[PDB]
Ligand binder design. Structure first.
Ligand SMILES: *[C@@H]1O[C@H](CO)[C@@H](O)[C@H](O)[C@H]1NC(C)=O
Ligand SMILES: *[C@@H]1O[C@H](CO)[C@@H](O)[C@H](O)[C@H]1NC(C)=O
Ligand SMILES: *[C@@H]1O[C@H](CO)[C@@H](O)[C@H](O)[C@H]1NC(C)=O
Ligand SMILES: *[C@@H]1O[C@H](CO)[C@@H](O)[C@H](O)[C@H]1NC(C)=O
Ligand SMILES: *[C@@H]1O[C@H](CO)[C@@H](O)[C@H](O)[C@H]1NC(C)=O
Ligand SMILES: *[C@@H]1O[C@H](CO)[C@@H](O)[C@H](O)[C@H]1NC(C)=O
Ligand SMILES: *[C@@H]1O[C@H](CO)[C@@H](O)[C@H](O)[C@H]1NC(C)=O
Ligand SMILES: *[C@H]1O[C@H](CO)[C@@H](O)[C@H](O)[C@H]1NC(C)=O
Ligand SMILES: [Hg+2]
Ligand SMILES: [Hg+2]
Ligand SMILES: [Hg+2]
Ligand SMILES: [Hg+2]
Ligand SMILES: [Hg+2]
Ligand SMILES: [Hg+2]
Lengths: 728, 728
């Protein structure tokens, strides 16, 4: 009798997950916004106070989009007139509110169209980027000191990243790193002069008479990449009129040999910076340790103190070289690295010593190092119950690596099997965030004896609403393919009954290092397909998938569009032999990498799939960005990996699409996976006389996330799938 | 007759219409290319021989695209390396083969990437355009003299048209006019310096890593237009030492006041040039008559033989000012002019005399004037039987305008009701080509005692094949709306039965001056729909339609998207009364203006149509080019016609599309009706939550006519009509 979870429930967000996003501000307090008051909370006791009254900024005269409070708490940054660029980049205007007075500063304001701004870690110095150059303000109401003069739109970038660096290398727009002191300001400079431009039309509102042409410096696989330089400036010695000096730190000679990337920057102490470099052929990386010289005022990077990682099996790291976590004295650090068995585990490195010491081991992987004090290293892993799709927090006593406690595994075991965490300063307290399989649960904890303090949000409201709906359930399990375990999940209709045959939709991603079978709770399209349409929605993690060692993850090295495509096909075959799936109605779908795989699968000739939908697919690896593509495929030259670049396009399989119903969807302002990609798919299908269905989304990007396009795309795909499956 | 006319039949051209395309070279001979031999025929006696054996250029090495025989028969131009640009423009390589000898010319060759070439009208001089400048060659083997020096890609065009002039004003790439003597070369020069650029992506072959951005100067409604100058050069007085002397003829003062166009250039005599100009507000045109002053060496245009044309109820002419046809002495001319009842008839004008004398009159119109001799003017009209969609050749004895003979009306009246004609020089002979309603029939005739000489092609072959096909029939008739006849045509399934109820597809074009109901024989998609799927395919000529007088044609003046739209809706309602139509299955489709009307009708909320298809539609007039749009719509400013430009978009009717099923299709490289227009349609349906189907065609233009794309669009559109009509 209860209602079923509908498409409109998913589209209009009727059943909302409650969050608890906080920001630690010391070792025992955090910020949290409640009824848009900015509150501070005391971790030990739970009492809270109003940091910034909800009311303040009513008469400000602009919607305020975000805020950033100075560390040594005298000022707050108000961000307004936000306009987005890419995934992380944007432009905004900024005001500064002096808290020890009820006053906005009216002088020497951060300019409009500022590209990035950051407080120093302690105090209240500011650094920002405007017209691609860096400026520094020692006091909020004083003139800034201009640090760089070479900034030039789409060409020279100081303190911010260009397109590939934002998106693929740093996952950030920012390229500024303050000293822990606030003394030094380090920054990167990117030069894109000879990087070729992607060009596409942007139509805008109907009033625009001529379409705009967007031009973005974007290196396609094998193309000229941007170069990079690294600098450090002393912020304590600046002059009102005299030009600031930037000291350059040069990449090591083993990188200057050819094309390379700056992949990570980390201050180990007030006087030591760690720079992690990577070769364009992403086989070799070097961490350089650079020390400030009292005498010279320059920075020395001793060659014998370089740390080097290489891979024979594939590439370095998952999506990048892993982060180094330094002990307080900066004399040693911890880092995740692939062990001799090919499983990622924590290694202990001492700076002027060469090898490292593994401190964890086994047939599972450390997902991340989350905190480090002198007594303990805290990390997240998939160790628990041998479930690669689960995640828990652990604690290692550094005096004996065998002394390891799981801090979250048994807290609430049927409801919580996927945790992330956020530690205060010095790791005195931590917030735990369980993401499933039950409703998300956010808790607070004390480190001394790992006692539970409270419960921050338990989603009881959602719980009450959900009891009135026929929610689907989720099965997480594995099949054997050729001697090996491969995991999958199924989202099953309510009142599931295995004596019936349900239509099956295989929801695929399957890019290198990905994981689609897990223990997270989600309310999504699949929820609606199972709850209302009685469709089984399955995801499978095959070769190339992550978190289960390099034998599985690297199987696809230099070979995209191969075993990962095959494995999705085999999984669907096995699913078909389960008494409960009807083999006449198996479909497949995905987005991005999932779109490519869906396309390759539909073009395989397998006969297993009746229909599929590819949204914003990659179609040919030569059309994709250098950093991501070359990492897995090398260079598209005859000298290297051209042949497989050519053998692994969707277009080459055009003829086999005659056996299937295909829906191809792409946003025309996709700066990431260019619309070109799908344009070449349709052209090939047309050259061969194959009929298929299509939809472009005007001015939409890779997310197709504007509110109306999002409703529209899922509406269209629901129609397509219902008809494929003969559902009214 | 058994088997039916199939989709494949249409797409594969199983049933070809034979043609007889001939080229007159004198008063009594024509060239005809059979297979690939060029044959010369004698018209009086009908004997023929081979002019150029198909074998001659076996060792040329290059595939020859076309040929052009000099007028004195001494040389032939061979065109090869043809690369198509827009509708008429293209580039190519040229050779000249010397006929009396059998020698290709190796000296002073026409250069590669030549943009236009033309022989003088009588002899063998050559004029060509390369890199936007004009060159002249007195003899094929001699050095060319450079006439212009200002040529500049996309900016200065000497002797060739820019995009708008090519497509909309001259309907030709050429902008060169040799005098009948070959003495003078007149030419036009276009300046597109400030015309804005339309920009769109061209993806090319799979191998292109980065898409190309195509950029073309194209004036949208109300934007800056190209300017034009007119020059004349004496080609008998050229020298290798001195530079060519071009004499400018300026446009009349009354055009010089504002933006204007050069619309038509005609040599009246060896020394007299007629230039027609039109104001950007296409309500005033001026014909200037200019004469060469032998002593001065100049050209003078007497403000007093200026002839003026103004429309009260609309614009001037049909798609442009009508062409003047000068008597041999040049002192008088005939031209089609709307008379005082609003019907287009032939007026006779004497060069320095006021007014003109109408030599035809009646409720019907002259379609074109085809030939002029001392004693007779020949012309085509729709007078016969009062059928506006019928066409026939007539003769008027000039010494008594009441003596009018119809030359084609009774040749074969049941098979032939739509004629065009091609006259030899001096009009001693004519080829009639009948287009329907029976199979095409080409005949040759002598003008003396209009005697039929021979049947050239009767399509006997096709006739026999069609006997074995269940061919649809065509019904051409009218309905009476207010007190006015509006014509329609229906294409009917074989074995039609007025007792059953058929689904109906309304096939629309309906732009200004157009005609979709006529007596022409066609083998097309409608043929298939009717013969195999049993769909009635109807078209209707409502207000705004042509050839029935200005009252109907001008009704849509400054109001595109109103009455032409409503009348299509009303025609469909009327077809529903007629008891052989299933009124649950009515669809509408169209291309271009037809896409626009289709979309305006689907979005009118009439409830009359179930579904419809729009191909490369105009969606908002501010997006379309200046010359065509402003003719019918004036300028889009607050002082002129902005309100109606804004209330006639497809986008404003978005919400209404929820009542119907729509398929929108457009090529991404459409340089005429920009993909933009459909991108704005799609985005408006998304912002209102309307689902619909789509198909973009990559790198296709307004014609979407490469064979694979043509096959693929009609295939996709057939599936769509079939499912909307519940037809397997
Ligand atoms: C919590 O309460 C204590 C005791 O009154 C007070 O000192 C502290 O400032 C309070 N913390 C907050 C964040 O309101
Ligand atoms: C920024 O924005 C406002 C309005 O857009 C303008 O008045 C102001 O002077 C600009 N400059 C600032 C605030 O730095
Ligand atoms: C950017 O690199 C190019 C080399 O192509 C060079 O012309 C230019 O000087 C560089 N600019 C800077 C500031 O490094
Ligand atoms: C037609 O026949 C006449 C008489 O022999 C001949 O002179 C003429 O050249 C022929 N014409 C053609 C085009 O074959
Ligand atoms: C045209 O191009 C071809 C091939 O590049 C060359 O052989 C020829 O010399 C060029 N010049 C001409 C034909 O005027
Ligand atoms: C083309 O027009 C531009 C803009 O007025 C003008 O500056 C230029 O001289 C013109 N050039 C020619 C050759 O007519
Ligand atoms: C010929 O005249 C043009 C302008 O009409 C000039 O630009 C060119 O340099 C001249 N060359 C000679 C040979 O005088
Ligand atoms: C701001 O906070 C107060 C105090 O809790 C709350 O009751 C009020 O509704 C809030 N008002 C706004 C502007 O959200
Ligand atoms: Hg990188
Ligand atoms: Hg990296
Ligand atoms: Hg990866
Ligand atoms: Hg014109
Ligand atoms: Hg014109
Ligand atoms: Hg017209």
């Amino acid at each position: 009798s209860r209602k079923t979870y509908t498409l409109t429930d998913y589209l209009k967000n009727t059943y909302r997950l409650k969050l608890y996003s906080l920001r630690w501000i010391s070792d025992h307090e955090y910020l949290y916004k409640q009824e848009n008051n900015i509150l501070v909370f005391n971790a030990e006791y739970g009492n809270s106070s109003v940091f910034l009254e909800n009311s303040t900024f009513d008469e400000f005269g602009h919607s305020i989009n975000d805020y950033s409070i100075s560390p040594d708490g005298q000022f707050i940054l108000l961000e307004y007139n936000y306009v987005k660029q890419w995934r992380h980049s944007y432009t905004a205007s900024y005001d500064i509110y002096d808290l020890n007075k009820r006053q906005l500063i009216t002088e020497e304001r951060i300019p409009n169209n500022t590209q990035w701004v950051t407080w120093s870690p302690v105090g209240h110095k500011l650094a920002y980027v405007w017209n691609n150059d860096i400026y520094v303000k020692i006091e909020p109401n004083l003139p800034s000191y201009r640090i760089t003069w070479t900034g030039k739109e789409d060409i020279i970038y100081n303190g911010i990243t260009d397109w590939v660096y934002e998106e693929e290398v740093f996952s950030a727009y920012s390229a500024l790193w303050w000293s822990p002191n606030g003394t030094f300001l380090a920054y990167a400079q990117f030069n894109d002069t000879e990087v070729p431009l992607i060009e596409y039309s942007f139509y805008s509102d109907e009033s625009l008479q001529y379409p705009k042409t967007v031009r973005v410096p974007y290196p396609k696989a094998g193309a000229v990449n941007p170069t990079v330089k690294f600098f450090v400036v002393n912020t304590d010695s600046l002059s009102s009129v005299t030009n600031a000096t930037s000291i350059q730190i040069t990449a090591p000679a083993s990188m200057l040999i050819g094309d390379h990337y700056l992949c990570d920057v980390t201050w180990a102490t007030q006087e030591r910076i760690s720079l992690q470099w990577l070769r364009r052929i992403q086989n070799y990386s070097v961490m350089d340790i650079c020390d400030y010289d009292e005498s010279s005022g320059r920075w020395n990077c001793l060659v014998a103190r370089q740390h080097i990682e290489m891979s024979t099996t594939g590439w370095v790291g998952r999506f990048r070289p892993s982060e180094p976590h330094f002990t307080l004295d900066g004399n040693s650090f911890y880092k995740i690295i692939s062990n001799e068995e090919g499983y990622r585990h924590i290694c202990y490195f001492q700076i002027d010593k060469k090898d490292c010491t593994f401190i964890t081991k086994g047939t599972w992987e450390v997902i991340g190092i989350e905190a480090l004090t002198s007594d303990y290293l805290y990390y997240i892993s998939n160790e628990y119950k041998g479930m690669p799709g689960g995640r828990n927090l652990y604690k290692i006593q550094l005096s004996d690596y065998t002394k390891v406690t799981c801090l979250s595994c048994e807290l609430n075991p049927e409801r919580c099997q996927y945790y992330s965490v956020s530690f205060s300063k010095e790791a005195k307290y931590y917030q735990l965030r369980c993401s499933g399989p039950g409703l998300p649960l956010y808790t607070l904890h004390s480190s001394v004896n790992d006692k539970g303090l409270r419960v921050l949000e338990d989603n009881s409201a959602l719980d009450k609403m959900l009891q009135n709906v026929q929610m689907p359930s989720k099965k997480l399990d594995f099949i054997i393919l050729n001697e090996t375990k491969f995991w999958y999940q199924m989202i099953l209709p309510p009142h599931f009954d295995k004596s019936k045959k349900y239509p099956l939709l295989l929801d695929v991603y399957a890019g290198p290092c990905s994981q689609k079978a897990d223990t997270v709770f989600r309310l999504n399209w699949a929820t609606y397909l199972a709850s209302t349409e009685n469709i089984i929605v399955a995801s499978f993690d095959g070769r190339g998938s992550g978190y289960q060692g390099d034998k599985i993850m690297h199987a696809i090295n230099r070979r995209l569009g191969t075993f990962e495509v095959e494995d999705q096909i085999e999984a669907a075959r096995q699913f078909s032999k389960m008494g409960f799936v009807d083999n006449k109605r198996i479909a497949i779908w995905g987005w991005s990498y999932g779109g490519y795989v869906t396309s390759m699968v539909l073009g395989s000739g397998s006969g297993v799939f009746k229909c599929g939908i590819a949204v914003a697919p990659v179609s040919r690896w030569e059309y994709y960005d250098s950093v991501y593509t070359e990492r897995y495929m090398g260079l598209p030259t005859p000298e290297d990996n051209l042949d497989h670049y050519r053998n692994s396009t969707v277009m080459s399989r055009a003829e086999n699409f005659k056996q299937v119903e295909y829906l191809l969807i792409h946003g025309t302002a996709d700066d990431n996976v260019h619309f070109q990609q799908s344009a070449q798919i349709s052209k090939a299908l047309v050259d061969v006389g194959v009929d298929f269905q299509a939809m472009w989304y005007t001015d939409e990007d890779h997310g197709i996330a504007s509110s109306t396009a999002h409703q529209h795309i899922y509406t269209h795909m629901s129609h397509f799938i219902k008809q494929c499956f003969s559902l009214p």
